[PDB]
UniProtKB/Swiss-Prot annotation, chain B:
UniProt record similarity statement: Belongs to the intimin/invasin family.
Protein source organism: Escherichia coli O127:H6 (strain E2348/69 / EPEC)
Chain residue ranges for the region called C-type lectin domain: 185-282
Protein name: Intimin
Biological process, per Gene Ontology: cell adhesion
Domain of life assignment: Bacteria
Function text: An inverse autotransporter. Adhesin, which mediates attachment to the human intestine epithelial cells. Necessary for the production of attaching and effacing lesions on infected human tissue culture cells. Anchored to the outer membrane by binding to peptidoglycan (PGN) via its periplasmic domain, thus helping in receptor interactions during host invasion. PGN-binding may also aid in resisting mechanical and chemical stress during transit of the bacterium through the gastrointestinal tract of the host.
Domain-level remarks: Has a signal sequence, a periplasmic Lys M domain, an inverse autotransporter domain (residues 189-430) predicted to form an outer membrane-embedded 12-stranded beta-barrel, followed by an extracellular passenger domain (residues 450-939) with 4 Big domains (residues 450-550, 559-653, 658-751 and 755-842) and a C-type lectin domain (residues 842-939). Beta-barrel forms a hydrophilic pore for the translocation of the passenger domain to the bacterial cell surface.
From-to range in the entire protein, with total length: 658 to 939 of 939
Subunit structure: Homodimer. Interacts with Tir.
UniProt-annotated stretches for the region Required and sufficient for interaction with intimin receptor Tir: 93-282
Keyword entries, A-Z: Cell adhesion, Cell outer membrane, Disulfide bond, Membrane, Repeat, Signal, Virulence
Length: 66, 282, 66
């Protein structure tokens, strides 16, 4: 009824999120005290944005069909 | 028939063939001063204006000396018609003193050349004097813009501006180097780590922009090298600095950074987290 | 490299497909010899279409980020 509005969305987000990290480009980086780079799970905003879009849009075709 | 006075107007002079030392001798016969008595001079260094002179009515006879090479000139006058002469006091010639504006060494690197037009505030260079008698003492016409070690000629750049440093040699000569106001003064606010926003917030604040590309910062390094070699930064093992945010960097919410110590250029850095330092230019 | 062009797409299709059957409307039906209705796994075309769209579109935001 109103669960696909998450299932379709949620399955999509994660999947797109998983494929994002397989590419360093999309990721962000931090600086340890020594001033050296370090990995920080977070992805670039225009990427998080771009995923959390095609997502709620996929979770939309969910409810509309229920 | 007797020289009783042999004086020299000074004892130091420039070996430029023009700076002259004047010798004055007095010829007497008891209390009576002898006139038109011819006196002969001789030096062991330099050119005498003449080698013979006749005393005036007061028994005086002046002569001059100059030299194109440095050294000790030992002059000696003698009354023509007599055998024994009289030695004047020893004098010394020194080459024109100068501050070489070409051999300015950059403390960090060790490279020598004109003074950089891009100053890493609190940076240091070594001015090199040439000539005089060897001993030097330096001075800045405005310790605020640039200061100099009294006896070593080490200069440390401070405020964006123009002043002139001078040097004086013990033989009492003077030379001066002009420090022209730089195109841009690099200033790393070392307080604490900070974010891209608080960064632009920092530059704009006290005044001035954030550095342009990494290159603009990279250049500083290729001029002064690891900024920690200079006293003022002798402790900061790292000076990762915020660079401008390209069109896409904005969107991606990240920036780039150049390190004024490790160099280590980096990209895709958290534009929000307190990752780098606030280094402002000009 | 060119796998997300499937991962993102494929994870999305299925998820949207799973939520489709939780609603009889979207499904199709067949007739057993006796002339009676029967369930036939297949979904309505405008539904398969509508899923296999938001899909290759989700698998698109995949490659574009790789």
């Amino acid at each position: 009824m109103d669960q696909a509005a998450n299932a379709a969305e949620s399955a999509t987000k994660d999947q797109l999120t998983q494929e994002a990290f397989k590419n360093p480009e999309n990721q962000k980086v931090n600086i340890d005290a020594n001033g050296n780079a370090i990995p920080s799970g977070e992805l670039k905003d225009d990427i998080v944005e771009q995923i959390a879009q095609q997502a709620k849009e996929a979770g939309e075709v969910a409810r509309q069909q229920a | 028939a007797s020289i009783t006075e042999i004086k020299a107007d000074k004892t130091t002079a420039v070996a430029n063939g023009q700076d002259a030392i004047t010798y004055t001798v007095k010829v007497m016969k008891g209390d009576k001063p002898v006139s038109n008595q011819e006196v002969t001079f001789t030096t062991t260094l330099g050119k005498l204006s003449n080698s013979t002179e006749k005393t005036d009515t007061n028994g005086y006879a002046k002569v001059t000396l100059t030299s194109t090479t440095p050294g000790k000139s030992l002059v000696s006058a003698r009354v023509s018609d007599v055998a024994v002469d009289v030695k004047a006091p020893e004098v010394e010639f020194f080459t024109t003193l100068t501050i070489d504006d070409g051999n300015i060494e950059i403390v960090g690197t060790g490279v020598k050349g004109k003074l950089p037009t891009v100053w890493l505030q609190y940076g240091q260079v070594n001015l090199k004097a040439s000539g005089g008698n060897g001993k030097y003492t330096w001075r800045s016409a405005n310790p605020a813009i640039a200061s100099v070690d009294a006896s070593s000629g080490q200069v440390t750049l401070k405020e964006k501006g123009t002043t002139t440093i001078s040097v004086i040699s013990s033989d009492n000569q003077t030379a001066t180097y002009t420090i022209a106001t730089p195109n841009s003064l690099i200033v790393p606010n070392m307080s604490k780590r900070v974010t891209y926003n608080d960064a632009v917030n920092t530059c704009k604040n006290f005044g001035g922009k954030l550095p342009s590309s990494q290159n603009e910062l990279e250049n500083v390094f290729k001029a002064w090298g690891a900024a920690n070699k200079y006293e003022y930064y002798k402790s900061s093992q790292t000076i990762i600095s915020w660079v401008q945010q390209t069109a896409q960097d904005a969107k991606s919410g990240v920036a780039s950074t150049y390190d004024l110590v490790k160099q280590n250029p980096l990209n895709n850095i958290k534009a929000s987290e307190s990752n780098a330092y606030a280094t402002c230019v000009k």
